[PDB]
Short mmCIF file of all heavy atoms in Angstrom, two decimals:
data_model
loop_
_atom_site.label_atom_id
_atom_site.label_comp_id
_atom_site.label_asym_id
_atom_site.label_seq_id
_atom_site.Cartn_x
_atom_site.Cartn_y
_atom_site.Cartn_z
N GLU A 1 240.20 286.92 45.97
CA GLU A 1 241.18 286.83 46.95
C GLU A 1 241.96 288.25 47.12
O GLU A 1 242.59 288.59 48.12
CB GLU A 1 242.21 285.78 46.65
N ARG A 2 241.77 289.05 45.94
CA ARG A 2 242.49 290.35 45.90
C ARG A 2 241.79 291.37 47.04
O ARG A 2 242.56 292.19 47.64
CB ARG A 2 242.36 291.00 44.59
CG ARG A 2 242.99 292.41 44.40
CD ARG A 2 243.06 292.84 42.94
NE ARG A 2 244.13 292.20 42.27
CZ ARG A 2 245.39 292.73 42.09
NH1 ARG A 2 245.65 293.98 42.47
NH2 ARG A 2 246.29 292.11 41.51
N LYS A 3 240.48 291.21 47.15
CA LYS A 3 239.79 292.01 48.11
C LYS A 3 240.09 291.61 49.63
O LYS A 3 240.20 292.55 50.46
CB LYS A 3 238.31 291.95 47.92
N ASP A 4 240.34 290.29 49.85
CA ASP A 4 240.64 289.76 51.21
C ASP A 4 242.01 290.42 51.69
O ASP A 4 242.00 290.83 52.77
CB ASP A 4 240.74 288.23 51.19
CG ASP A 4 239.51 287.66 51.16
OD1 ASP A 4 238.37 288.32 51.42
OD2 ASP A 4 239.48 286.35 50.98
N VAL A 5 242.99 290.38 50.81
CA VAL A 5 244.37 290.91 51.17
C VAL A 5 244.28 292.42 51.43
O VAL A 5 245.00 293.05 52.13
CB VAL A 5 245.32 290.65 49.91
CG1 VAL A 5 246.73 291.24 50.36
CG2 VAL A 5 245.51 289.15 49.64
N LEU A 6 243.20 293.07 50.85
CA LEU A 6 243.02 294.48 51.04
C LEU A 6 242.30 294.86 52.46
O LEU A 6 242.56 295.87 52.98
CB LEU A 6 242.25 295.10 49.89
CG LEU A 6 242.86 295.13 48.56
CD1 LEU A 6 241.73 295.47 47.40
CD2 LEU A 6 244.07 296.06 48.48
N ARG A 7 241.51 293.94 52.79
CA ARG A 7 240.79 293.93 54.07
C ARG A 7 241.75 293.98 55.20
O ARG A 7 241.63 294.90 56.03
CB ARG A 7 239.76 292.78 54.15
CG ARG A 7 239.04 292.77 55.52
CD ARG A 7 238.22 291.48 55.78
NE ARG A 7 237.68 291.43 57.03
CZ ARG A 7 236.61 292.01 57.59
NH1 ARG A 7 235.89 292.76 56.74
NH2 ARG A 7 236.18 291.79 58.74
N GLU A 8 242.58 292.90 55.15
CA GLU A 8 243.58 292.69 56.26
C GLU A 8 244.55 294.01 56.27
O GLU A 8 244.73 294.61 57.36
CB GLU A 8 244.46 291.49 56.00
CG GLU A 8 245.49 291.19 57.15
CD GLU A 8 246.07 289.88 57.05
OE1 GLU A 8 245.80 289.05 56.16
OE2 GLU A 8 246.83 289.55 58.13
N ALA A 9 245.10 294.44 55.22
CA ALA A 9 245.92 295.62 55.00
C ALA A 9 245.19 296.79 55.64
O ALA A 9 245.82 297.56 56.36
CB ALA A 9 246.37 295.87 53.69
N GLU A 10 243.98 297.15 55.31
CA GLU A 10 243.23 298.24 55.80
C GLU A 10 243.05 298.12 57.27
O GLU A 10 243.23 299.18 58.00
CB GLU A 10 241.89 298.34 55.14
CG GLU A 10 241.15 299.73 55.35
CD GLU A 10 239.65 299.72 55.03
OE1 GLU A 10 239.14 298.58 54.71
OE2 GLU A 10 239.03 300.68 55.02
N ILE A 11 242.84 296.99 57.78
CA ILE A 11 242.61 296.69 59.19
C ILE A 11 243.90 297.00 60.13
O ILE A 11 243.98 297.89 60.94
CB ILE A 11 242.08 295.32 59.54
CG1 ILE A 11 240.68 295.23 59.29
CG2 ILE A 11 242.30 294.96 60.89
CD1 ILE A 11 239.98 293.86 59.20
N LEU A 12 245.00 296.37 59.60
CA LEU A 12 246.40 296.67 60.07
C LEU A 12 246.77 298.12 60.18
O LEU A 12 247.32 298.63 61.16
CB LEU A 12 247.46 295.81 59.48
CG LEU A 12 247.64 294.33 59.68
CD1 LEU A 12 248.32 293.68 58.61
CD2 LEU A 12 248.33 294.10 60.97
N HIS A 13 246.41 298.84 59.14
CA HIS A 13 246.65 300.22 58.99
C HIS A 13 245.75 300.96 59.93
O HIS A 13 246.29 301.95 60.75
CB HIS A 13 246.45 300.64 57.57
CG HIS A 13 246.84 302.23 57.36
ND1 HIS A 13 248.06 302.67 57.78
CD2 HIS A 13 246.28 303.19 56.76
CE1 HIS A 13 248.07 303.88 57.52
NE2 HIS A 13 246.95 304.35 56.81
N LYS A 14 244.51 300.64 60.24
CA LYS A 14 243.60 301.30 61.15
C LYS A 14 243.98 300.88 62.56
O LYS A 14 243.82 301.74 63.44
CB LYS A 14 242.17 301.11 60.77
CG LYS A 14 241.75 301.79 59.42
CD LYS A 14 240.29 301.52 59.17
CE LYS A 14 239.75 302.13 57.94
NZ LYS A 14 238.38 301.79 57.60
N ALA A 15 244.15 299.63 62.73
CA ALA A 15 244.38 299.11 64.07
C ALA A 15 245.85 299.24 64.60
O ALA A 15 246.27 298.70 65.64
CB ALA A 15 243.98 297.64 64.04
N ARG A 16 246.82 300.03 63.91
CA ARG A 16 248.05 300.29 64.38
C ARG A 16 248.21 300.76 65.78
O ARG A 16 247.36 301.69 66.23
CB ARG A 16 248.99 301.08 63.39
CG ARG A 16 248.40 302.40 63.10
CD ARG A 16 249.33 303.36 62.23
NE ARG A 16 249.51 302.80 60.83
CZ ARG A 16 250.56 302.25 60.46
NH1 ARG A 16 251.62 302.09 61.35
NH2 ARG A 16 250.85 301.80 59.28
N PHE A 17 249.03 300.08 66.75
CA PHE A 17 249.28 300.30 68.00
C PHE A 17 250.43 299.58 68.54
O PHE A 17 250.95 298.62 67.85
CB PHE A 17 247.93 299.92 68.79
CG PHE A 17 248.10 300.14 70.23
CD1 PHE A 17 248.25 301.34 70.86
CD2 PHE A 17 247.94 299.06 71.09
CE1 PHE A 17 248.25 301.54 72.14
CE2 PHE A 17 248.00 299.16 72.42
CZ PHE A 17 248.31 300.48 73.03
N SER A 18 251.01 300.06 69.65
CA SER A 18 252.16 299.49 70.27
C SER A 18 252.31 297.92 70.16
O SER A 18 253.49 297.40 69.95
CB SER A 18 252.14 299.80 71.74
OG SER A 18 252.03 301.26 72.02
N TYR A 19 251.27 297.21 70.31
CA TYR A 19 251.35 295.77 70.38
C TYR A 19 250.65 295.04 69.18
O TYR A 19 250.48 293.78 69.27
CB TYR A 19 250.82 295.17 71.75
CG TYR A 19 251.54 296.00 72.86
CD1 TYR A 19 250.75 296.92 73.57
CD2 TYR A 19 252.79 295.71 73.18
CE1 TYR A 19 251.35 297.76 74.59
CE2 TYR A 19 253.44 296.40 74.25
CZ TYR A 19 252.73 297.36 74.81
OH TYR A 19 253.26 298.14 75.83
N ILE A 20 250.34 295.72 68.17
CA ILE A 20 249.86 295.14 66.82
C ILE A 20 251.04 295.29 65.78
O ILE A 20 251.60 296.35 65.63
CB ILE A 20 248.62 295.91 66.40
CG1 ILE A 20 247.39 295.58 67.22
CG2 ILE A 20 248.20 295.42 65.04
CD1 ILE A 20 247.36 296.19 68.72
N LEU A 21 251.15 294.23 65.00
CA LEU A 21 252.18 294.14 63.98
C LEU A 21 252.12 295.29 63.06
O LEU A 21 251.01 295.60 62.50
CB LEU A 21 252.09 292.90 63.09
CG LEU A 21 252.96 292.70 61.94
CD1 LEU A 21 254.51 292.69 62.21
CD2 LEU A 21 252.63 291.30 61.24
N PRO A 22 253.21 296.16 63.03
CA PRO A 22 253.15 297.32 62.28
C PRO A 22 253.24 297.00 60.75
O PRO A 22 254.09 296.30 60.36
CB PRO A 22 254.46 298.06 62.69
CG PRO A 22 254.83 297.46 63.94
CD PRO A 22 254.44 296.13 63.81
N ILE A 23 252.31 297.54 59.90
CA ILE A 23 252.25 297.35 58.55
C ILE A 23 252.97 298.61 57.93
O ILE A 23 252.53 299.72 58.20
CB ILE A 23 250.81 297.30 58.01
CG1 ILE A 23 250.73 297.20 56.54
CG2 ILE A 23 249.94 298.52 58.48
CD1 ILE A 23 249.38 297.09 55.81
N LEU A 24 253.98 298.40 57.19
CA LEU A 24 254.85 299.42 56.65
C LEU A 24 254.30 299.99 55.29
O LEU A 24 254.62 301.19 55.03
CB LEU A 24 256.27 298.91 56.46
CG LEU A 24 257.08 298.61 57.77
CD1 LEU A 24 258.49 298.17 57.37
CD2 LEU A 24 257.18 299.85 58.71
N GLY A 25 253.58 299.22 54.64
CA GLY A 25 252.91 299.57 53.29
C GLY A 25 252.42 298.41 52.64
O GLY A 25 252.60 297.16 52.82
N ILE A 26 251.62 298.79 51.49
CA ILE A 26 251.04 297.75 50.63
C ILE A 26 251.66 297.68 49.25
O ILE A 26 252.16 298.73 48.68
CB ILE A 26 249.49 298.15 50.32
CG1 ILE A 26 248.80 296.92 49.66
CG2 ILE A 26 249.30 299.45 49.61
CD1 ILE A 26 247.29 297.03 49.64
N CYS A 27 251.78 296.49 48.70
CA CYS A 27 252.44 296.22 47.46
C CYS A 27 251.37 295.72 46.37
O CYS A 27 251.22 294.54 46.24
CB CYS A 27 253.60 295.35 47.53
SG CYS A 27 254.54 295.09 45.99
N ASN A 28 250.70 296.62 45.82
CA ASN A 28 249.56 296.28 44.86
C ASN A 28 249.91 296.57 43.41
O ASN A 28 250.13 297.72 42.98
CB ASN A 28 248.32 297.07 45.27
CG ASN A 28 247.11 296.51 44.55
OD1 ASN A 28 247.02 295.46 44.04
ND2 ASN A 28 246.11 297.46 44.31
N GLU A 29 250.16 295.43 42.65
CA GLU A 29 250.50 295.51 41.28
C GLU A 29 249.74 294.40 40.62
O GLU A 29 249.25 293.32 41.18
CB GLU A 29 251.93 295.32 41.14
CG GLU A 29 252.75 296.53 41.42
CD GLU A 29 254.28 296.31 41.31
OE1 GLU A 29 254.71 295.19 40.96
OE2 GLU A 29 255.05 297.25 41.54
N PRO A 30 249.52 294.38 39.27
CA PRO A 30 248.85 293.31 38.48
C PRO A 30 249.71 292.06 38.49
O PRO A 30 249.18 291.06 38.43
CB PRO A 30 248.75 293.90 37.02
CG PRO A 30 248.83 295.48 37.21
CD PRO A 30 249.75 295.63 38.38
N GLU A 31 251.07 292.22 38.64
CA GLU A 31 251.97 291.20 38.63
C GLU A 31 251.97 290.55 40.02
O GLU A 31 251.90 289.28 40.04
CB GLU A 31 253.40 291.74 38.34
CG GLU A 31 254.45 290.59 38.43
CD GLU A 31 255.87 291.22 38.47
OE1 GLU A 31 256.14 292.33 38.13
OE2 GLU A 31 256.66 290.46 38.98
N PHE A 32 252.17 291.40 41.06
CA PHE A 32 252.30 290.85 42.41
C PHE A 32 251.43 291.53 43.49
O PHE A 32 251.38 292.94 43.28
CB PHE A 32 253.78 291.01 42.76
CG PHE A 32 254.06 290.50 44.18
CD1 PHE A 32 254.41 289.27 44.39
CD2 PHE A 32 254.11 291.40 45.24
CE1 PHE A 32 254.76 288.80 45.69
CE2 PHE A 32 254.46 291.04 46.43
CZ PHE A 32 254.76 289.69 46.75
N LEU A 33 250.82 290.90 44.34
CA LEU A 33 250.12 291.56 45.43
C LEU A 33 250.50 290.93 46.86
O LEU A 33 250.42 289.67 47.08
CB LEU A 33 248.56 291.37 45.17
CG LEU A 33 247.63 291.90 46.28
CD1 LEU A 33 247.89 293.28 46.57
CD2 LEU A 33 246.25 291.55 45.99
N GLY A 34 250.77 291.93 47.67
CA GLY A 34 251.24 291.50 49.09
C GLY A 34 251.09 292.61 50.15
O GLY A 34 250.85 293.73 49.90
N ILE A 35 251.25 292.19 51.45
CA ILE A 35 251.26 293.15 52.54
C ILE A 35 252.74 293.32 53.07
O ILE A 35 253.48 292.23 53.35
CB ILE A 35 250.28 292.75 53.65
CG1 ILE A 35 248.86 292.80 53.17
CG2 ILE A 35 250.44 293.60 54.87
CD1 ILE A 35 247.79 292.33 54.16
N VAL A 36 253.13 294.49 53.19
CA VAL A 36 254.56 294.68 53.71
C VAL A 36 254.54 295.15 55.14
O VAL A 36 254.18 296.33 55.37
CB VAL A 36 255.44 295.62 52.83
CG1 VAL A 36 256.82 295.68 53.25
CG2 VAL A 36 255.28 295.27 51.36
N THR A 37 254.96 294.35 56.03
CA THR A 37 255.05 294.67 57.46
C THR A 37 256.51 294.74 57.92
O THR A 37 257.32 294.60 57.19
CB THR A 37 254.33 293.63 58.29
OG1 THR A 37 254.98 292.35 58.38
CG2 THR A 37 252.82 293.52 57.85
N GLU A 38 256.62 294.91 59.23
CA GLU A 38 257.96 294.96 59.80
C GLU A 38 258.33 293.42 59.97
O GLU A 38 257.43 292.57 59.99
CB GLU A 38 258.00 295.59 61.18
CG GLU A 38 257.86 297.09 61.22
CD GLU A 38 257.86 297.61 62.62
OE1 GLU A 38 258.27 296.92 63.54
OE2 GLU A 38 257.61 298.87 62.70
#
């Protein structure tokens, strides 16, 4: 599941554009893993 969350994050980062949800950053830790968007 860790790889899946990375796939989405990489895509949002590459696919950034006026009408695509802006991804502000990734939060990757052994404790917690998430995607930080607007």
Side-chain angles (χ1 to χ4, degrees), residues 2 4-38:
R2 177 170 287 261
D4 284 348
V5 178
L6 294 170
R7 174 187 173 85
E8 185 168 3
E10 188 194 12
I11 286 172
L12 282 159
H13 184 53
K14 291 181 180 174
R16 53 176 66 253
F17 177 65
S18 308
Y19 310 104
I20 289 76
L21 175 59
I23 179 180
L24 296 179
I26 190 172
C27 186
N28 191 25
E29 291 177 357
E31 175 197 344
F32 179 90
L33 177 59
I35 292 179
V36 190
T37 67
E38 289 183 7

